[PDB]
Amino acid sequence: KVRLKELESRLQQVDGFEKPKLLLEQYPTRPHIAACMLYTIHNTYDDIENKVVADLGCGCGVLSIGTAMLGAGLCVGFDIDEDALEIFNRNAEEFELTNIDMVQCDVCLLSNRMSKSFDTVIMNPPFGTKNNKGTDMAFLKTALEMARTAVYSLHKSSTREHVQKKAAEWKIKIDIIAELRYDLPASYKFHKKKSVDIEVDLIRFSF
Amino acid sequence: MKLLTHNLLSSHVRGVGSRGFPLRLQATEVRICPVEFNPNFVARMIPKVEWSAFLEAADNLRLIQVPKGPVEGYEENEEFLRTMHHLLLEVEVIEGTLQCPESGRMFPISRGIPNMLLS
Ligand SMILES: *CCC(=O)N1C[C@@H]2[C@H](C1)[C@@H](c1cccc(Cl)c1)C[C@H]2Oc1ccc(NC(C)=O)cc1
Ligand SMILES: C[S@@+](CC[C@H](N)C(=O)[O-])C[C@H]1O[C@@H](n2cnc3c(N)ncnc32)[C@H](O)[C@@H]1O
């Protein structure tokens, strides 16, 4: 049994990006965010232990590392950037976690790939506009195609109504399980009154 | 890349439409990596494995005596679950290729990571 503070402590030991790529919105999932999110997924919903899990936009691996310590049978991380994945591999090896794999790919181009191959999908996606919609919405479409049971994701709280509308169109059950805030990299604050932090919803999608 | 991961990457839901095809695996470098045995997980995975694709991949990695399908009583067969644990999770492709059946293009596996981009 891993307690919440213990989990968060461990996730503080995950090393981040060596030269984060701004265009890909590279920042590690923040330890308190990841710990509360994964602890809920495991202890409230039982959506990790003995499951096969996908982490979309896995980065340096914070969410996957935590998932692997909570009893997953296998967590597979997916990211477009090889440099992120090199770091993730290093982190997994440091933690001695061998119930992990990772794959380099573009999550927005996974139509009909790994359909219903995972129990659970978890993600902290990018938000940038990609073909008229948030990249997070492209990630969501992929996640729902890949997942059998549940998707857990962080979306801007400012987009809540849009997410709710798409879930209804898709006949997906949606539950907003927490309202969270965390700091973006300082370099993201490019106009005077832009907040340093971002308000997100942790959302559980299910079928 | 583990063989369970190859199986998921390669998978298609079988239905009324035509058969999909797996990625053909070749390897130049393999390593054995112990994973803590989770018999509950392995038993859950048995009915989800696409067995023809698993057998092809295992043969290409020079694995031997590979179970040819799910055995009688397999949730109670600790030996079969232990064997499948090893073959699905502990045999890692480090350097290799995945070949797309519809194009013939090679997608490289390097440092254990498949690169599925169309570079
Ligand atoms: C038969 C295999 C094949 O056609 N592809 C196209 C790539 C990749 C392999 C697909 C895929 C299959 C199974 C698992 C995964 Cl993780 C991925 C998806 C498809 O993805 C891409 C990614 C990038 C591009 N473009 C560029 C410019 O790189 C196209 C397609
Ligand atoms: C906020 S970071 C995710 C944080 C991650 N959970 C971690 O702990 O490092 C967003 C990630 O999405 C990846 N990414 C961006 N666009 C992508 C795409 N189209 N497909 C896959 N990964 C993508 C980035 O490279 C980056 O690692």
GROMACS .gro file of C-alpha atoms and ligand atoms in nm:
model
  383
    1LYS     CA    1   0.000   0.000   0.000
    2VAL     CA    2   0.150   0.332  -0.116
    3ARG     CA    3   0.014   0.632   0.074
    4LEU     CA    4  -0.048   0.964  -0.103
    5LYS     CA    5   0.251   1.150   0.048
    6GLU     CA    6   0.483   0.858  -0.025
    7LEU     CA    7   0.365   0.848  -0.387
    8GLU     CA    8   0.416   1.224  -0.428
    9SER     CA    9   0.765   1.196  -0.269
   10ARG     CA   10   0.863   0.929  -0.519
   11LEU     CA   11   0.728   1.131  -0.811
   12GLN     CA   12   0.944   1.429  -0.702
   13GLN     CA   13   1.243   1.203  -0.789
   14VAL     CA   14   1.142   1.170  -1.156
   15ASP     CA   15   1.385   1.381  -1.363
   16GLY     CA   16   1.243   1.625  -1.614
   17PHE     CA   17   1.318   1.736  -1.968
   18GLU     CA   18   1.678   1.826  -2.054
   19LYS     CA   19   1.583   2.083  -2.318
   20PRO     CA   20   1.206   2.113  -2.318
   21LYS     CA   21   1.052   2.181  -2.659
   22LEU     CA   22   0.814   2.472  -2.628
   23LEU     CA   23   0.618   2.383  -2.944
   24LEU     CA   24   0.531   2.043  -2.794
   25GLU     CA   25   0.429   2.193  -2.456
   26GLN     CA   26   0.694   1.993  -2.272
   27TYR     CA   27   0.672   2.019  -1.893
   28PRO     CA   28   0.657   1.729  -1.644
   29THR     CA   29   0.324   1.655  -1.483
   30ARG     CA   30   0.365   1.829  -1.146
   31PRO     CA   31   0.420   1.585  -0.856
   32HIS     CA   32   0.120   1.690  -0.649
   33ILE     CA   33  -0.105   1.675  -0.960
   34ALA     CA   34   0.020   1.333  -1.060
   35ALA     CA   35   0.001   1.190  -0.708
   36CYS     CA   36  -0.355   1.299  -0.643
   37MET     CA   37  -0.468   1.192  -0.992
   38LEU     CA   38  -0.309   0.842  -0.978
   39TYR     CA   39  -0.404   0.784  -0.613
   40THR     CA   40  -0.768   0.848  -0.708
   41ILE     CA   41  -0.753   0.631  -1.020
   42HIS     CA   42  -0.620   0.343  -0.809
   43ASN     CA   43  -0.801   0.378  -0.476
   44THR     CA   44  -1.137   0.519  -0.588
   45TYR     CA   45  -1.184   0.352  -0.927
   46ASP     CA   46  -0.945   0.053  -0.926
   47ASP     CA   47  -0.839   0.138  -1.284
   48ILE     CA   48  -0.462   0.062  -1.251
   49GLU     CA   49  -0.380  -0.259  -1.058
   50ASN     CA   50  -0.350  -0.563  -1.284
   51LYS     CA   51  -0.441  -0.347  -1.585
   52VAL     CA   52  -0.271  -0.251  -1.910
   53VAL     CA   53  -0.253   0.125  -1.919
   54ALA     CA   54  -0.154   0.379  -2.188
   55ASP     CA   55  -0.006   0.720  -2.103
   56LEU     CA   56  -0.051   0.955  -2.402
   57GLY     CA   57   0.208   1.232  -2.424
   58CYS     CA   58   0.405   1.051  -2.157
   59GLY     CA   59   0.702   1.291  -2.164
   60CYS     CA   60   0.964   1.221  -1.907
   61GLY     CA   61   0.727   0.968  -1.753
   62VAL     CA   62   0.583   1.101  -1.429
   63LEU     CA   63   0.234   0.953  -1.479
   64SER     CA   64   0.368   0.622  -1.612
   65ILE     CA   65   0.624   0.585  -1.333
   66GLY     CA   66   0.350   0.633  -1.076
   67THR     CA   67   0.113   0.395  -1.257
   68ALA     CA   68   0.382   0.124  -1.267
   69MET     CA   69   0.435   0.157  -0.887
   70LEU     CA   70   0.061   0.112  -0.821
   71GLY     CA   71   0.048  -0.240  -0.958
   72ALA     CA   72  -0.019  -0.201  -1.335
   73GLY     CA   73   0.055  -0.519  -1.532
   74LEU     CA   74   0.205  -0.295  -1.803
   75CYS     CA   75   0.209   0.078  -1.864
   76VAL     CA   76   0.294   0.190  -2.218
   77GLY     CA   77   0.390   0.553  -2.268
   78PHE     CA   78   0.351   0.722  -2.607
   79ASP     CA   79   0.522   1.050  -2.706
   80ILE     CA   80   0.624   1.217  -3.035
   81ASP     CA   81   0.969   1.321  -2.904
   82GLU     CA   82   1.261   1.083  -2.885
   83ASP     CA   83   1.449   1.307  -2.641
   84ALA     CA   84   1.162   1.285  -2.389
   85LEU     CA   85   1.149   0.910  -2.424
   86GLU     CA   86   1.524   0.876  -2.362
   87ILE     CA   87   1.474   1.052  -2.029
   88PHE     CA   88   1.172   0.840  -1.948
   89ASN     CA   89   1.371   0.524  -2.013
   90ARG     CA   90   1.643   0.652  -1.780
   91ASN     CA   91   1.389   0.731  -1.512
   92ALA     CA   92   1.226   0.383  -1.538
   93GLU     CA   93   1.569   0.219  -1.510
   94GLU     CA   94   1.658   0.434  -1.204
   95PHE     CA   95   1.333   0.332  -1.028
   96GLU     CA   96   1.394  -0.032  -1.130
   97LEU     CA   97   1.047  -0.043  -1.296
   98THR     CA   98   1.027  -0.311  -1.565
   99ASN     CA   99   0.647  -0.318  -1.613
  100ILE     CA  100   0.689  -0.020  -1.851
  101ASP     CA  101   0.731   0.016  -2.227
  102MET     CA  102   0.732   0.318  -2.454
  103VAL     CA  103   0.661   0.409  -2.814
  104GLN     CA  104   0.745   0.707  -3.034
  105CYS     CA  105   0.442   0.821  -3.234
  106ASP     CA  106   0.203   1.104  -3.309
  107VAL     CA  107  -0.105   1.049  -3.090
  108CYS     CA  108  -0.313   1.267  -3.326
  109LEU     CA  109  -0.256   1.018  -3.612
  110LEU     CA  110  -0.354   0.693  -3.438
  111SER     CA  111  -0.691   0.637  -3.616
  112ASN     CA  112  -0.782   0.264  -3.600
  113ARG     CA  113  -0.458   0.178  -3.417
  114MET     CA  114  -0.467  -0.021  -3.094
  115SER     CA  115  -0.847  -0.005  -3.090
  116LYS     CA  116  -0.980  -0.112  -2.752
  117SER     CA  117  -0.634  -0.253  -2.668
  118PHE     CA  118  -0.595  -0.082  -2.326
  119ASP     CA  119  -0.800  -0.098  -2.004
  120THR     CA  120  -0.724   0.258  -1.903
  121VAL     CA  121  -0.572   0.565  -2.074
  122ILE     CA  122  -0.423   0.850  -1.869
  123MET     CA  123  -0.278   1.178  -1.999
  124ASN     CA  124  -0.175   1.538  -1.934
  125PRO     CA  125  -0.212   1.656  -2.296
  126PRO     CA  126  -0.097   1.971  -2.477
  127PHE     CA  127  -0.356   2.246  -2.533
  128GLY     CA  128  -0.233   2.421  -2.849
  129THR     CA  129  -0.469   2.464  -3.145
  130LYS     CA  130  -0.426   2.179  -3.399
  131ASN     CA  131  -0.650   2.195  -3.704
  132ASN     CA  132  -0.916   2.420  -3.548
  133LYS     CA  133  -0.944   2.235  -3.212
  134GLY     CA  134  -0.740   2.189  -2.896
  135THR     CA  135  -0.467   1.926  -2.923
  136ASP     CA  136  -0.619   1.787  -2.600
  137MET     CA  137  -0.942   1.710  -2.792
  138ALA     CA  138  -0.746   1.516  -3.057
  139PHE     CA  139  -0.574   1.326  -2.774
  140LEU     CA  140  -0.918   1.257  -2.624
  141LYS     CA  141  -1.056   1.115  -2.943
  142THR     CA  142  -0.759   0.879  -2.966
  143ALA     CA  143  -0.779   0.789  -2.596
  144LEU     CA  144  -1.145   0.692  -2.616
  145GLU     CA  145  -1.076   0.469  -2.918
  146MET     CA  146  -0.789   0.295  -2.734
  147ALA     CA  147  -0.951   0.251  -2.394
  148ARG     CA  148  -1.196  -0.021  -2.296
  149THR     CA  149  -1.296   0.102  -1.950
  150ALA     CA  150  -1.182   0.455  -1.868
  151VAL     CA  151  -0.989   0.766  -1.976
  152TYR     CA  152  -0.847   1.011  -1.721
  153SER     CA  153  -0.730   1.349  -1.852
  154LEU     CA  154  -0.660   1.710  -1.761
  155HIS     CA  155  -0.845   1.977  -1.962
  156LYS     CA  156  -0.858   2.353  -1.914
  157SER     CA  157  -1.150   2.437  -1.682
  158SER     CA  158  -1.230   2.722  -1.926
  159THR     CA  159  -1.317   2.460  -2.191
  160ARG     CA  160  -1.545   2.251  -1.964
  161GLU     CA  161  -1.869   2.317  -2.150
  162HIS     CA  162  -1.707   2.225  -2.483
  163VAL     CA  163  -1.574   1.899  -2.340
  164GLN     CA  164  -1.919   1.821  -2.194
  165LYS     CA  165  -2.081   1.887  -2.533
  166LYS     CA  166  -1.843   1.657  -2.719
  167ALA     CA  167  -1.889   1.380  -2.462
  168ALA     CA  168  -2.266   1.402  -2.514
  169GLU     CA  169  -2.227   1.391  -2.894
  170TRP     CA  170  -1.999   1.085  -2.855
  171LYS     CA  171  -2.233   0.911  -2.603
  172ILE     CA  172  -1.946   0.905  -2.349
  173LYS     CA  173  -2.009   0.935  -1.976
  174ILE     CA  174  -1.822   1.231  -1.829
  175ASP     CA  175  -1.746   1.308  -1.464
  176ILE     CA  176  -1.551   1.611  -1.347
  177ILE     CA  177  -1.368   1.465  -1.045
  178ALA     CA  178  -1.143   1.759  -0.936
  179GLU     CA  179  -1.060   2.126  -1.005
  180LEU     CA  180  -0.684   2.173  -0.991
  181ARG     CA  181  -0.425   2.439  -1.052
  182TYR     CA  182  -0.058   2.415  -1.135
  183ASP     CA  183   0.223   2.635  -1.263
  184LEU     CA  184   0.318   2.648  -1.627
  185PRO     CA  185   0.686   2.707  -1.713
  186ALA     CA  186   0.778   3.072  -1.649
  187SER     CA  187   0.867   3.116  -2.014
  188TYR     CA  188   0.500   3.053  -2.108
  189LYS     CA  189   0.397   3.391  -1.954
  190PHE     CA  190   0.435   3.602  -2.269
  191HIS     CA  191   0.187   3.888  -2.195
  192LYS     CA  192   0.154   4.104  -1.882
  193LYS     CA  193  -0.166   3.967  -1.722
  194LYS     CA  194  -0.127   3.606  -1.840
  195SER     CA  195  -0.151   3.385  -1.530
  196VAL     CA  196   0.160   3.185  -1.436
  197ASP     CA  197  -0.065   2.890  -1.360
  198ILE     CA  198  -0.344   2.705  -1.533
  199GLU     CA  199  -0.682   2.590  -1.400
  200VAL     CA  200  -0.762   2.237  -1.513
  201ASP     CA  201  -1.032   1.978  -1.456
  202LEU     CA  202  -0.939   1.617  -1.385
  203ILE     CA  203  -1.204   1.432  -1.587
  204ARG     CA  204  -1.300   1.064  -1.596
  205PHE     CA  205  -1.455   0.946  -1.923
  206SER     CA  206  -1.625   0.608  -1.941
  207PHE     CA  207  -1.864   0.405  -2.149
  208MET     CA  208   0.972  -0.352  -2.679
  209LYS     CA  209   0.806  -0.650  -2.511
  210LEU     CA  210   0.599  -0.905  -2.705
  211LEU     CA  211   0.277  -0.799  -2.531
  212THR     CA  212   0.350  -0.443  -2.655
  213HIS     CA  213   0.413  -0.577  -3.011
  214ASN     CA  214   0.078  -0.757  -2.989
  215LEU     CA  215  -0.111  -0.441  -2.890
  216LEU     CA  216   0.066  -0.229  -3.152
  217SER     CA  217  -0.019  -0.489  -3.414
  218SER     CA  218  -0.380  -0.550  -3.309
  219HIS     CA  219  -0.713  -0.518  -3.482
  220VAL     CA  220  -1.060  -0.600  -3.351
  221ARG     CA  221  -1.185  -0.903  -3.545
  222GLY     CA  222  -1.538  -0.854  -3.675
  223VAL     CA  223  -1.740  -0.878  -3.996
  224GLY     CA  224  -1.486  -0.683  -4.201
  225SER     CA  225  -1.165  -0.814  -4.352
  226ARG     CA  226  -0.871  -0.930  -4.144
  227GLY     CA  227  -0.606  -0.678  -4.039
  228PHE     CA  228  -0.239  -0.773  -4.034
  229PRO     CA  229   0.028  -0.737  -3.763
  230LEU     CA  230   0.360  -0.558  -3.785
  231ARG     CA  231   0.629  -0.804  -3.886
  232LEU     CA  232   0.905  -0.809  -3.623
  233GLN     CA  233   1.277  -0.857  -3.689
  234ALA     CA  234   1.537  -0.815  -3.419
  235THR     CA  235   1.913  -0.769  -3.414
  236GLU     CA  236   1.945  -0.725  -3.037
  237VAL     CA  237   1.731  -0.882  -2.763
  238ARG     CA  238   1.770  -0.873  -2.385
  239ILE     CA  239   1.605  -1.067  -2.104
  240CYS     CA  240   1.455  -0.841  -1.837
  241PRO     CA  241   1.292  -0.991  -1.525
  242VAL     CA  242   0.950  -0.846  -1.446
  243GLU     CA  243   0.771  -0.919  -1.123
  244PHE     CA  244   0.522  -1.198  -1.196
  245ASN     CA  245   0.160  -1.086  -1.177
  246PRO     CA  246  -0.045  -1.405  -1.247
  247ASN     CA  247  -0.374  -1.215  -1.219
  248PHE     CA  248  -0.257  -0.981  -1.496
  249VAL     CA  249  -0.122  -1.255  -1.719
  250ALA     CA  250  -0.446  -1.455  -1.690
  251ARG     CA  251  -0.643  -1.142  -1.789
  252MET     CA  252  -0.417  -1.095  -2.091
  253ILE     CA  253  -0.439  -1.455  -2.227
  254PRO     CA  254  -0.777  -1.408  -2.412
  255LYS     CA  255  -0.661  -1.070  -2.547
  256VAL     CA  256  -0.348  -1.199  -2.722
  257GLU     CA  257  -0.366  -1.232  -3.097
  258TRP     CA  258  -0.202  -1.574  -3.104
  259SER     CA  259  -0.093  -1.596  -3.469
  260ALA     CA  260   0.090  -1.262  -3.443
  261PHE     CA  261   0.249  -1.363  -3.110
  262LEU     CA  262   0.370  -1.696  -3.255
  263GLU     CA  263   0.524  -1.527  -3.563
  264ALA     CA  264   0.704  -1.268  -3.350
  265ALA     CA  265   0.824  -1.526  -3.095
  266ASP     CA  266   0.961  -1.744  -3.377
  267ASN     CA  267   1.148  -1.445  -3.520
  268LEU     CA  268   1.313  -1.394  -3.179
  269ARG     CA  269   1.421  -1.764  -3.179
  270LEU     CA  270   1.196  -1.847  -2.884
  271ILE     CA  271   1.118  -2.218  -2.848
  272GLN     CA  272   0.848  -2.452  -2.718
  273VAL     CA  273   0.608  -2.157  -2.741
  274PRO     CA  274   0.253  -2.252  -2.633
  275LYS     CA  275   0.045  -2.279  -2.952
  276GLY     CA  276  -0.268  -2.130  -2.787
  277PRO     CA  277  -0.455  -2.110  -2.447
  278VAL     CA  278  -0.429  -2.436  -2.251
  279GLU     CA  279  -0.696  -2.632  -2.068
  280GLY     CA  280  -0.769  -2.466  -1.732
  281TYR     CA  281  -0.511  -2.193  -1.790
  282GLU     CA  282  -0.612  -1.965  -1.497
  283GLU     CA  283  -0.517  -2.256  -1.266
  284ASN     CA  284  -0.207  -2.356  -1.468
  285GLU     CA  285   0.076  -2.168  -1.290
  286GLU     CA  286   0.337  -2.314  -1.527
  287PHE     CA  287   0.154  -2.186  -1.839
  288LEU     CA  288   0.101  -1.843  -1.677
  289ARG     CA  289   0.470  -1.826  -1.575
  290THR     CA  290   0.579  -1.928  -1.929
  291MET     CA  291   0.351  -1.671  -2.091
  292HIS     CA  292   0.469  -1.404  -1.843
  293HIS     CA  293   0.824  -1.465  -1.957
  294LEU     CA  294   0.749  -1.471  -2.330
  295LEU     CA  295   0.511  -1.168  -2.323
  296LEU     CA  296   0.692  -0.940  -2.076
  297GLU     CA  297   1.056  -1.047  -2.019
  298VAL     CA  298   1.190  -1.085  -2.375
  299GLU     CA  299   1.271  -0.731  -2.490
  300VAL     CA  300   1.360  -0.624  -2.842
  301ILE     CA  301   1.627  -0.356  -2.813
  302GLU     CA  302   1.729  -0.315  -3.178
  303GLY     CA  303   1.503  -0.425  -3.458
  304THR     CA  304   1.229  -0.332  -3.706
  305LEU     CA  305   0.854  -0.345  -3.744
  306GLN     CA  306   0.739  -0.381  -4.102
  307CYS     CA  307   0.408  -0.231  -4.209
  308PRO     CA  308   0.203  -0.490  -4.406
  309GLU     CA  309   0.023  -0.234  -4.625
  310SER     CA  310   0.338  -0.040  -4.735
  311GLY     CA  311   0.639  -0.262  -4.666
  312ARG     CA  312   0.800   0.032  -4.480
  313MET     CA  313   1.038  -0.045  -4.188
  314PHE     CA  314   0.979   0.131  -3.859
  315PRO     CA  315   1.294   0.106  -3.642
  316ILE     CA  316   1.312  -0.015  -3.283
  317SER     CA  317   1.613   0.142  -3.111
  318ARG     CA  318   1.705   0.134  -2.741
  319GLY     CA  319   1.390  -0.072  -2.698
  320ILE     CA  320   1.161   0.199  -2.845
  321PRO     CA  321   0.967   0.160  -3.170
  322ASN     CA  322   0.961   0.483  -3.376
  323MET     CA  323   0.628   0.476  -3.561
  324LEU     CA  324   0.660   0.822  -3.726
  325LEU     CA  325   0.662   0.870  -4.106
  326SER     CA  326   0.991   1.059  -4.097
  327LIG     C1  327   0.135  -0.006  -4.136
  327LIG     C2  328   0.198   0.091  -4.040
  327LIG     C3  329   0.180   0.234  -4.083
  327LIG     O1  330   0.124   0.264  -4.186
  327LIG     N1  331   0.214   0.337  -4.004
  327LIG     C4  332   0.176   0.477  -4.024
  327LIG     C5  333   0.202   0.546  -3.889
  327LIG     C6  334   0.224   0.430  -3.792
  327LIG     C7  335   0.281   0.316  -3.875
  327LIG     C8  336   0.083   0.403  -3.739
  327LIG     C9  337   0.082   0.320  -3.612
  327LIG    C10  338   0.046   0.185  -3.616
  327LIG    C11  339   0.046   0.110  -3.500
  327LIG    C12  340   0.088   0.164  -3.380
  327LIG    C13  341   0.123   0.297  -3.375
  327LIG    CL1  342   0.182   0.366  -3.225
  327LIG    C14  343   0.126   0.373  -3.490
  327LIG    C15  344   0.022   0.543  -3.725
  327LIG    C16  345   0.084   0.628  -3.835
  327LIG     O2  346   0.128   0.749  -3.765
  327LIG    C17  347   0.188   0.851  -3.836
  327LIG    C18  348   0.273   0.935  -3.766
  327LIG    C19  349   0.335   1.040  -3.832
  327LIG    C20  350   0.302   1.069  -3.964
  327LIG     N2  351   0.366   1.177  -4.029
  327LIG    C21  352   0.492   1.223  -4.009
  327LIG    C22  353   0.529   1.343  -4.094
  327LIG     O3  354   0.575   1.165  -3.935
  327LIG    C23  355   0.215   0.986  -4.032
  327LIG    C24  356   0.155   0.877  -3.968
  328LIG     C1  357   0.259   1.849  -2.050
  328LIG     S1  358   0.365   1.738  -2.143
  328LIG     C2  359   0.307   1.581  -2.065
  328LIG     C3  360   0.370   1.556  -1.934
  328LIG     C4  361   0.405   1.411  -1.904
  328LIG     N1  362   0.292   1.343  -1.837
  328LIG     C5  363   0.530   1.412  -1.816
  328LIG     O1  364   0.515   1.379  -1.696
  328LIG     O2  365   0.640   1.449  -1.871
  328LIG     C6  366   0.291   1.707  -2.305
  328LIG     C7  367   0.365   1.598  -2.380
  328LIG     O3  368   0.300   1.577  -2.507
  328LIG     C8  369   0.398   1.540  -2.603
  328LIG     N2  370   0.337   1.560  -2.735
  328LIG     C9  371   0.303   1.681  -2.794
  328LIG     N3  372   0.237   1.666  -2.906
  328LIG    C10  373   0.229   1.528  -2.924
  328LIG    C11  374   0.171   1.445  -3.023
  328LIG     N4  375   0.106   1.489  -3.130
  328LIG     N5  376   0.178   1.311  -3.008
  328LIG    C12  377   0.242   1.263  -2.902
  328LIG     N6  378   0.302   1.330  -2.804
  328LIG    C13  379   0.290   1.463  -2.819
  328LIG    C14  380   0.516   1.628  -2.566
  328LIG     O4  381   0.634   1.586  -2.631
  328LIG    C15  382   0.511   1.625  -2.413
  328LIG     O5  383   0.602   1.530  -2.357
   0.00000   0.00000   0.00000
